Each structure stands twice: as structure tokens, then as C-alpha cells.
């Protein structure tokens, strides 16, 4: 262990040495931020070239962030990453099944091997992240596969926390940017005209802070928390609201999903990071599940942050010079649906 000395800011010590395999991610970026702010020792396994992880260097202090070369297929790389970590956090995930990695791999196969080694190593705790409402029978292969994982990893690593976040709201997120980027599309398809798929977003930071707090709290063991949010929404208001802040016309036109799953298939064929995914589509119209579960935010210590509050920052880049100065007050809020 490492006795925590310091005042609490950078150049201080908190005693959390933590491997974080998928740090380069949108959620990840945030996880390393708090861990680094707190003063924790963060080992970031990376596969993308050094150029892309530079954004993580200034976070954390000198000799507090260590970057290791790692390959998912190669078991040895995971082995050495967790050699000297006592906390392992797994954020490995993707939306597009890539040529050389299947949803199973990114969600269930890999995240197993990882926790498996972590145990061999003797890491005190492992945090595994799987998408919210993930039935072993859910339509989207992604969600189901993720469900498959949360089970397995429990056998490789017992009492391994399993936070299960909803789609995340944050700058650089998809949930909010995706819809806002429908601008290019003249019309914005919305299955069931964006109805009956009530959704509860959660700010990225809230998720991050929550995750971090897990690392430094004994109360969470085998817990399957669910960071959800401060307000639910029918996809209709969300879509329009977005377009509202973006100040771009909103033209909700219903599109039969059966045909739309096909549109997802189309972009899905794209070689360079398909923008929409068959598995995405389903997910988007996959209704958010209700909140009866080990609570996440608040329960883990952070009060959720309403979407409207920070939406202005996430959607600003999509506006035009004409609306750039416009502020949240000028715009209207969307409506929640306790349903």
C-alpha cells in the first residue's frame, strides 16, 4: 500500500497504482484525469502509436503516469501491465466489430483474460465496465455479448465490481454528438418518430468520478452499480433539444427500423470506423431500463449532473457563427418522462 500524504492536488500521493487498459477512450480520458488529479499511480496500457496518447501525458504528474505497449491477442502483454498494479480498471469496448476483433473479443473475450491475469498478479480489486440494460438476450449483439462477459469475469475474478453505465453524455461522446451530426443528413431518421425509447444520459465526469471513487472505497465489492443520470427523456426531445442548441432545423421523420437496421449495415460496411452500426441502431432505439438496482452515482458519492447544464459545451462546435454567442438561457429545455 501507499500511505496517502499530501494536500490533495497534483504532486501529491493517494496510493492507487492502477492499470487502465482502454484509457485512450472517451470515458478513459476522464478516468485518467481524476486518477491523475488525485495523485494515483496510473499505468496506461496502449496499442495506438505514442502520438495519440500524448493527450494523457499532461494529466497526472511526472512518474505518475506510465505507458505500456500491449496487444490483446498476446497474453504476455496483459501479464506485465498488472505485475505492479493493485487496481485494474477495464474499459475495453467498441461499437463496430472490427476485422480482427469481434464484439466478443472487445467485451467478453479480452476483458476476461485481463481480470484473469490481474488475479494471478494479486490486484486488490478489478472494475469491469459493461453497457446498461445488457441482457444475455438483448437484441444488439453488443449488449448481449457484454452481458456474457460480466458473468465470466466474475469466475476469473470474484467480487470484481461491475459498474454498468448508460449511454454516456459528454464532449466527444457519441450519444450527443451523433444526433447533432445528423445535420449533414437533411432528414434525421428517428425510429417510431423518436418515441418509446426513453433514454437517461449520464455526464461522463459523473461516470468517471464514480468509477474513481470505487477504486478508493471498501463498500464496493461484487457491486454492480448503475450510473444513470439526473433526468430521463423520450428520444424526441433529446433529438430536437440537441438540434435546438445546435440551432439547426429539426425534421423528425419516422423510419421503419427493419429498413434502418439496413442503413446501419451500410455505414457499417465502411472501412474507416463506420459512423452508424447495425448494433448501434438497435441500441439507440433500445429503451433505457428502469432504475431499480445498486445505485451508482450519489450512491458512490457524486451527484449526477443534468444534461442541459453542460450540453452547451458539447454541442457548441456544431453551431454556426450566427449562433455561437447564443447561450443556454435563450434555448428551451427538453421534457423528462418518468415512464
Amino acid at each position: 500500500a501507499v500511505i496517502p500524504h499530501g494536500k490533495g492536488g497534483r504532486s501529491s500521493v493517494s496510493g492507487v497504482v492502477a492499470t487502465v487498459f482502454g484509457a485512450t477512450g472517451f470515458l478513459g480520458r476522464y478516468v485518467v484525469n481524476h486518477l491523475g488529479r488525485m495523485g494515483s499511480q496510473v499505468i496506461i496500457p496502449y496499442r495506438c502509436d505514442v502520438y495519440d496518447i500524448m493527450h494523457l501525458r499532461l494529466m497526472g504528474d511526472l512518474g505518475q503516469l506510465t505507458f505500456l505497449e500491449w496487444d490483446a491477442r498476446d497474453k504476455d502483454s496483459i501479464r506485465k501491465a498488472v505485475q505492479h498494479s493493485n487496481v485494474v480498471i477495464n474499459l475495453i469496448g467498441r461499437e463496430w466489430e472490427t476485422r480482427n476483433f469481434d464484439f466478443e473479443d472487445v467485451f467478453v473475450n479480452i476483458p476476461r483474460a485481463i481480470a484473469q491475469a490481474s488475479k494471478e498478479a494479486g490486484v486488490e480489486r478489478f472494475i469491469h465496465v459493461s453497457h446498461l440494460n445488457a441482457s444475455m438476450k438483448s437484441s444488439s449483439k453488443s449488449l448481449r455479448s457484454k452481458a456474457v462477459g460480466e458473468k465470466e469475469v466474475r469466475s476469473v475474478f470474484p467480487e470484481a465490481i461491475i459498474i454498468r453505465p448508460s449511454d454516456i453524455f459528454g464532449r466527444e461522446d457519441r450519444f450527443l454528438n451523433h444526433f447533432a451530426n445528423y445535420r449533414w443528413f437533411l432528414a434525421v431518421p428517428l425510429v417510431s418518430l423518436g418515441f418509446k425509447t426513453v433514454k437517461q444520459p449520464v455526464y461522463v465526469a459523473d461516470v468517471s468520478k464514480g468509477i474513481v471513487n470505487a477504486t478508493k472505497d471498501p463498500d464496493a465489492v461484487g457491486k454492480t452499480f448503475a450510473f444513470t443520470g439526473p433526468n430521463r427523456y423520450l428520444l424526441f426531445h433529446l433529438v430536437k433539444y440537441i438540434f435546438g442548441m445546435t440551432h439547426r432545423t429539426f425534421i423528425p421523420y419516422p423510419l421503419p427500423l427493419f429498413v434502418y437496421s439496413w442503413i446501419g449495415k451500410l455505414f457499417g460496411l465502411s472501412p474507416f470506423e463506420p459512423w452508424t452500426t447495425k448494433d448501434k441502431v438497435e441500441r439507440i432505439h433500445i429503451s433505457d431500463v428502469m432504475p431499480t438496482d445498486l445505485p451508482g452515482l450519489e450512491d458512490l458519492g457524486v451527484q449526477p449532473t443534468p444534461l442541459e447544464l453542460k450540453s452547451i459545451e458539447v454541442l457548441r462546435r456544431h453551431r454556426t457563427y450566427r449562433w455561437l454567442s447564443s447561450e443556454i438561457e435563450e434555448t428551451k429545455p427538453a421534457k423528462t418522462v418518468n415512464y
Binding site: 501507499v2 497504482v17 512518474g63 506510465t66 505500456l68 506485465k80 505485475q83 505492479h84 498494479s85
Partner: protein, 83 residues
């Protein structure tokens, strides 16, 4: 390992620093290298070790080699001299 037995414990995490890198240490250790040099058998009670090279050496000091049992050792070089 290092000159002073600085060896991170099997559980310390600064060992992560050495992961995928060389922990810099020097094979040539002084404690040993001075030993090799033999005791200088001077024939005067007090001799001086200018440090070798005069101005290019260490401050000049005189050592009393009177103690028959032990040998004088320059607080600077570590060189030993006996009468």
C-alpha cells in the same frame, strides 16, 4: 543493487518505472575499487595526500601513520598509507 543497496522491494510500484526500461546502475562500485589499491608503505610518520595531481586533485592533508596497528586513510581519496 546500487552502491547503497537501493533495491525496490518486490511489491513497490516504482518498479513499474523499470518496466520495459533499464534501471541505471554502475558496475564499478567505489567501495570496492578503492580496496584494490594497495596500502602505501611510507617511511615518515606524517605524510601528505595532495590528492594526486596537485591542483587537479583534492585539498592537501597530512596523515599521521603513527598508529602501528592501523593505516592512515585520506578522508578524500580513501587511499591508505602505512609506515
Amino acid at each position: 543493487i546500487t552502491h547503497t543497496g537501493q533495491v525496490y522491494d518486490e511489491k513497490d510500484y516504482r518498479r513499474v518505472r523499470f518496466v520495459d526500461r533499464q534501471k541505471e546502475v554502475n558496475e564499478n562500485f567505489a567501495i570496492d575499487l578503492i580496496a584494490q589499491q594497495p596500502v602505501n608503505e611510507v617511511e615518515h610518520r606524517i605524510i601528505a595526500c595532495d590528492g594526486g595531481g596537485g591542483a587537479l586533485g583534492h585539498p592537501k592533508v597530512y596523515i599521521n601513520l603513527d598508529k602501528e596497528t592501523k593505516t592512515g586513510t585520506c578522508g578524500y581519496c580513501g587511499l591508505q598509507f602505512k609506515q
